[model samples]
Target: LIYTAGGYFRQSLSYLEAYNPSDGTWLRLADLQVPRSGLAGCVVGGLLYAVGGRNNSPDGNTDSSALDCYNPMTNQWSPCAPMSVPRNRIGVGVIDGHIYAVGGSHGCIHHNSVERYEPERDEWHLVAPMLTRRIGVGVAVLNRLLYAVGGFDGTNRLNSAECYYPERNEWRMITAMNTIRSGAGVCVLHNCIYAAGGYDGQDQLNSVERYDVATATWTFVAPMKHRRSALGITVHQGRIYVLGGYDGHTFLDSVECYDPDTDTWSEVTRMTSGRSGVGVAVT
Candidate 1:
């Protein structure tokens, strides 16, 4: 569940059980450990892992490399070993029961690093690095190949994408998106890769792009209602939910739902407060 606190606090992890989805339903869940913003999260099995994100990005305050895992079945929180490199604006996903965390800045330089997280052992192993240096990117797993999408390339935003084959232990470049963007949301659903709403350097974007894994082609989709960046996107209940992104300056609380069966997007419930760069995972 992705949501902000009741007040104006941005990305406060205190808002447990407050997530009101697009369908107007609410359920109780465990709250986060930190109060920081821009936190990224991923679910492995029944455990929810919350990763690095600062309370504020401008000054880079509240940066944490710690890994906080939540067990919904037991409703508990456990602190594990911290990330070797401290980073924020990261993308984490699970493929074949292993977690692949890709691309983020390390306070000074934007990185292309990749790591494999083993939950059972509670350890992380370094993997092959990406060709492009990036931070705040989107990650998706299609056909068992991990796809790292648009993100910041140091001074500029990037449109290019790449693929990582775990078996080969290498990273390969793929076709680029129509728009150069960063801090957007991505998900692999319905046999297509969808990336939506992010900053395009000069302005926030509402653009949505879809990629065909088999054909290596890109196609534009319906734009989002609000142009936003630094958001989280995931598949839940068979729908795509784009959550908690900022529009250049201000954060957004609005929720948007995309139904591929009808090829339509509808504005739905709004979160309690404005927040961008939330780590989202649904179980």
Candidate 2:
């Protein structure tokens, strides 16, 4: 089963749903206690956890530090301790047993704070922050290192990227992307970090980039067909799957897939309706 939680629907929403790939069906689950957008989610130890985001756009307030978890076995929602600071546009990933919440915003101020959740303790602790403040960062874990890719600072869309070394408790700037973007789809496929379409200051973007872990370098990759930002992204069956997102003029329900083996992308089926600000996973 794949799950995604609350998202925008004219206003922030509290909807939660799960998808079953066997039948290609979606089942609406219980609503989230707090309605929010720009939130991020990840699966850790069989539970789905939704991390911080805004109640509205960055221009609006109502940012949150909320951490809500969902259990598929019980079909229930539960709360974790709120984050140390209100966060929006944060990236979340699980490394070892800890859930790391990466950069985002606390109201208008962007953040570089990094914090992790300890399941055994049910507590959150601060860790080494990122080298730069960002919103809409893309995060993933590979070879035990957590990476933060392109995102926007308050003033401009960013192409810079970095990674964290837990043993050393330090962050080192990595190769920057060839194109500036915010809210891009960043995922790992075959040990590479693929950063897909996102918004630049001028327009929605279709340009995608990749990071090679062994080389410590970045390069442009085949672009997605749709120009989008804030798209739902995941890796399944050896391919990168991208879901709904905004295209400057409209929200999208179109789905697409990228095959790393072929270095190409192809269109998949669309969702029932246009959606942005939601999540997608495959189980």
Candidate 3:
């Protein structure tokens, strides 16, 4: 199952939809409690959790800090304790049964802080902050630790990356990417992190990069077919799939597929609609 939660589609949305590859069908689930854009979501303990996002209208409600989760088994939605900080375009991941909310911005300022949620207790606890304050970072769990990749850090688009070891409650700087970027799509495959297209401050980008966990290094990979920002990225049938995003001139409906064997990116079927700042997950 691949799930897409709230995002902007000309306007902020509260819709939830799922794609069933086995049957080539789409199922519309319950709408979100709050219409939002720039949200982040992830699955932990078999539940889908939607985090911070903003309402995209001028007078839109900016109370985008709320936390909500849905249970597919029950077809119901529930609220969780909100974060101490409100932010959007944050990176989310699960490690050791805890859901981690990584670096993002609070509209006016970028943040380097981290928060961990314990589903069992329905509580969130602050964790060690990253060395860099970033927005729209790419986060992934590899080798039992969390990695925070490229994003805009207020002053500039960032290439610097860092890893967090929960056991030590510390973040150590790692090799930076070849390009400065924010809002990139990232996923862990074959023990490495694949960071796809994003905005590079000057322009929306189609460039791609890979971070090797074992080598502690970043290497340039094949570029994406389209320049994508705020896109949904997940592994599908052994291939890296990058979905809808904003490409500077237009909101994109394009989807790209990457094959590791050939180290190439090619276009695939387009999504039915265009979106940006969407949350996507593979189950």
Candidate 4:
């Protein structure tokens, strides 16, 4: 799926434009509610969901906890059940037809809150908090099991990870990542877990790590040419596409691809705009 970058804070974010990696083409899409810098998003059951990031915070109480749902066919946005807490840098995914919003970062602190929204009922339900509090983490549900990867705990970067088993109503810590990182690209490829480029304290990194779910250990794979942070990462057409991100001092439109079969990172297509902190979700 392709992604569109919102017109930044200077504008009210009335429109968005995008480029397709597969064909090197540009396309226009519907706009979001308001211009936002950072936000969390997820795709489930052909519907795209957007969660908190500050659009307008009049006071501490006015921070956005609002949720919006997007319909691809109509290219329109609609209000959905909101989250339980106001946060930024949140993680979201789907499991058993329900949308699960994982940990997030409030302006003041990192939260361990978890919320589940069922579209059928159009309501939200609170769930058990994660054992470890995380913000800026990446989440993906493969084989009915939900996995949460590394993120910041507000004090320090976390190398730890966890898996949520809905049947027993429990969250269990799993194997730790080789290096501590935040905003890593997480995707499931042929049953294995892949975490791509992200920041690791000193600077942005292009390191790619693979987690063997069957064996529960990590192995380093090919690294991306561009070391970036706050980019959009997704897998489409059997390859990992690292979307627009910031290098160090500047925004980037550079995109790269990783082929699982060859385990290599090479030059690929690019997006129309150089954007960081973008919310990418596909239907």
Candidate 5:
């Protein structure tokens, strides 16, 4: 099952739904505790963890440090220990049972800081910060190392990438992508880290790229059918599925799947509603 929660639909939304790939149907789940967008999510020990995001307010958008955990067995959401600071457009990944929240933004300020959550202690610890401040970053765990991909760095979209060594509690720069990307959907498949559609500062993108850890290089892959940014992406049954995001002109409910073996993308069933800055996790 693939779960998606909290995204922008005119404003920050609390919508939560689960997709059953076997039947190609969506099931409504409990709403998020708070309405937000630009959040990051991942599954840890069968529970879904929704990380920091922002809420729309009359004055302006307010970033949040709230962390919500969803229990599939109970179909409910509950609060968890929050992060050290508010973070919107954050990147998240799980490493050896601990959840790491990477760089994001707070209002107009971008962050180079990172935090690690220990489920057993129900607490968060300040971790080594990224080398560069970023928002809309893409994160994936490959070979036990957390890879932080392309994102916006205040003034420009980035093509640079980095990897975090949990044991060393440090981040080191890695090979950059061929194209600059912000809000890219990234996931690990067949030992390679795939970064799908995202904004390139100038335009939404349909282009895709993959990082080969063995070679420490990034290469272009077949592009998606539609340009997308802030999309939800995950790997299931050897294929990568990318869902709802913005295409520069409009919000999208469309879904697409990429097969590594064929090096291609195919349109899949659309979501019940359009969503951008959505969080996706497969369990």
Candidate 6:
């Protein structure tokens, strides 16, 4: 099963939906407790988690650092311990049964801050910070390390990347991508990490790149048919799926899939509604 949660259309949304790959159908699930955008989602032990992202209210007084968990069995969402700081457009990954929240921003202040959540304790504690501040960063776990890819640093759309060493509580820089990307969607497939569709400071991007952990290098792949930023990406049945996001001019309801074997992207079924900065996870 594939799941998606809160994101932005015109305002922050509480929408939650699930996709069943077997039948290629979508099912509406419970709405998020808090409407937000720029959140990240991951599944741990059969529960879905919606992590830090902001509410787009004009007052700007509401907290966006909420951590909400959904139980599919009960079809309900419950609040969990919030993060230490508010993070919008944060990146998230699960390693060793712990969820890691990577760099993000609150208002104009970007962060290099990273934190880990212990499900059993219902607590979140700080982990080592990243080498660079980022918002809309893409995160994926491979070989037990969490890789933090391109995002905005309050200054520029970055092409640089880094990975966290959980055992040592450290982050090390990695080779930069060929193109700068913010709000890119990232996933791991066949031992390679793929980063796709993001904003590059100047325009929305359709370009995709793959990183080989063995070589510590990146290579270009086939671009998506439509430019996208703030999209949701995940791997299911050996295929990479890129979901709804903004395409510079409009919020998108379109979905696309990349087949590793053919090195190609093909259109998939559309979502129920348009979304950007959405969270995606496969369970």
Best candidate per TM-score, number? Answer: 5
RMSD of 3: 1.6
Reference-based lDDT, each prediction: 0.77, 0.82, 0.84, 0.74, 0.92, 0.91
Candidate 6 lDDT over residue span 1-283, tens digit each: 7798988898888889988866789999899987888999999998999999988856553537889999999999999999999999999999989999998898777999999999999999998999999999999999999999999999888999998999999999999999999999998998899999999988999999999988989999999998999999989899999889998898998989999899899987899999898899877
lDDT of 4 by residue, 1-283 (tens): 5554342222223334545665677777788876554566677778777776555333322335667877878888888878888766667778888888888777777877788889888898988889888887878787888888888888887778899887776799999999887877777777788877777777888888989887999899999999887677766777777777767877777878898889889878766656666666655
Instruction: List clashing residue pairs in candidate 3.
Output: none
TM-score of 3: 0.95
Q: Would you list the rank order by lDDT, best first?
A: 5, 6, 3, 2, 1, 4
List residue ranges in candidate 2 displaced over 4 A.
Answer: 57-61
For lDDT, the strongest prediction is 5
Superposed on all Cα atoms, model 4 deviates from the true structure by an RMSD in Å of 2.6
- lDDT assessment of candidate 2: 0.82
The clash count for each model shown is: 1, 0, 0, 0, 0, 0
- Candidate 5 stretches with Cα past 4 Å from truth are 57-60
Report the CA-based lDDT of candidate 1 relative to the real structure: 0.77
TM-score of the candidate numbered 5?
0.98
- Candidate 5 lDDT score at position 230: 96
The residue-by-residue lDDT of candidate 2 on 1-283, one tens digit each, is 5566766656776777765555778788888888887888788787888889878744565989988888878878899998999877888877887889998988678898899998778899999999999899888888889999888889888999998998898999888888887988888888788889988888888888888877877888888899989887888778888877889988887778898878898886676667676655554
Please say which candidate is ahead in lDDT: 4 or 6: 6
Listed per candidate, the RMSD to the true structure in angstroms reads 2.7, 2.2, 1.6, 2.6, 1.0, 1.2
**Model 6 off-target regions past 4 Å?**
58-63
Question: Where in model 1 is the C-alpha error above 4 Å?
Answer: 1-14, 17-23, 57-60
Location of the lowest summed lDDT over 10 successive residues in candidate 2:
274-283
Ranking the candidates on TM-score from highest down gives 5, 6, 3, 2, 1, 4
Per-residue lDDT tens digits of candidate 3, residues 145-195?
899999988888898889999999999999888888899998887768988
* Native-referenced Cα lDDT, model 4: 0.74
